[PDB]
């Protein structure tokens, strides 16, 4: 997260860490949507060009974390995965269209003050809040800047970061990149000349872009951090998987269990 700030404990209890077993590595962010299912980005799991195709036996999820590197004994929970389901029409070759995957936990995870699921959006919530200028919040343990100056450590956070970002008009998103933007994605970030700056970065992918509905006071996950061209580059915006649009697929997989 660039230009974000340290998270308060429990500020995003659905935040999950996708952790590679070997070598040990923080791969991406992710979100808890129930005590058995976790949502993340498909490119965090499958990417043929780099021979990437992680299976359920290759990774773990760490739930309830705050520190990026410490083992938060008695607070976090480390779970194995039973199965992983990548969207069948995820377009890795061209634009990462439908960048979403569901991870099914081996055992359901007990909730706590630091472990609690986020809501998936309904039509009403999407039509009233997913509009240009409305702010969503992104969290993650990703890099603090696109790159470092002197030492690598200056850009690795010690704890989970949070940043608030405004949704950007579709024509503007389209004009900012050569990539073909589909209806399955939306973009956010401050304009080429706002006071504020902020964006997701390397390591935040798969994490959630959330909004708090004024209608029922609940937090909804409207997007999944998907991709960007650099981090916090003026004139560029971060792109997100439009979760509501892929809700039917989520429902299909869950009740089918893939």
């Amino acid at each position: 997260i660039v230009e974000g700030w340290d998270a308060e404990k429990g500020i995003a209890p659905w935040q999950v860490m996708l952790f590679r077993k070997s070598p040990q590595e923080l791969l991406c962010g992710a979100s808890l949507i129930s005590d058995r299912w976790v949502l993340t980005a498909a490119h965090c799991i499958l990417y043929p060009p780099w021979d990437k195709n992680f299976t359920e036996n290759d990774l773990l999820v760490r739930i309830g974390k705050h520190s990026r590197t410490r083992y938060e004994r008695n607070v976090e929970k480390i779970s194995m995965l039973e199965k992983i389901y990548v969207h069948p029409r995820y377009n890795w070759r061209e634009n990462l269209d439908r960048d979403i995957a569901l991870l099914k936990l081996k055992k359901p995870v007990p909730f706590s003050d630091y472990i609690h699921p986020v809501c998936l959006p309904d039509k009403q919530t999407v039509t009233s809040l997913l509009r240009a200028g409305y702010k969503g919040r992104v969290t993650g343990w990703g890099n603090l800047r696109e790159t470092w100056t002197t030492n690598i450590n200056e850009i690795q956070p010690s704890v989970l970061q949070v940043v608030n970002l405004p949704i950007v008009e579709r024509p503007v998103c389209k004009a900012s990149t050569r990539i073909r933007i589909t209806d399955n994605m939306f973009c956010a970030g401050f304009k080429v000349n706002d006071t504020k700056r902020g964006d997701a970065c390397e390591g935040d992918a798969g994490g959630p872009f959330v909004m708090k509905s004024p209608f029922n006071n609940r937090w909804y996950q409207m997007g999944i951090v998907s991709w960007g061209e650099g981090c916090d580059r003026k004139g560029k915006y971060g792109f997100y998987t439009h979760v509501f649009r892929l809700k039917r697929w989520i429902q299909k997989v869950i009740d089918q269990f893939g």
């Binding site: 923080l26 773990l60 590197t69 480390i78 194995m80 995870v109």
Partner: peptide, 13 residues
């Protein structure tokens, strides 16, 4: 230099 603090195999859910 282990970015990550180790955790016991016994502690995994």
């Amino acid at each position: 230099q282990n970015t990550f603090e180790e955790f016991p195999l016994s502690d995994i859910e």
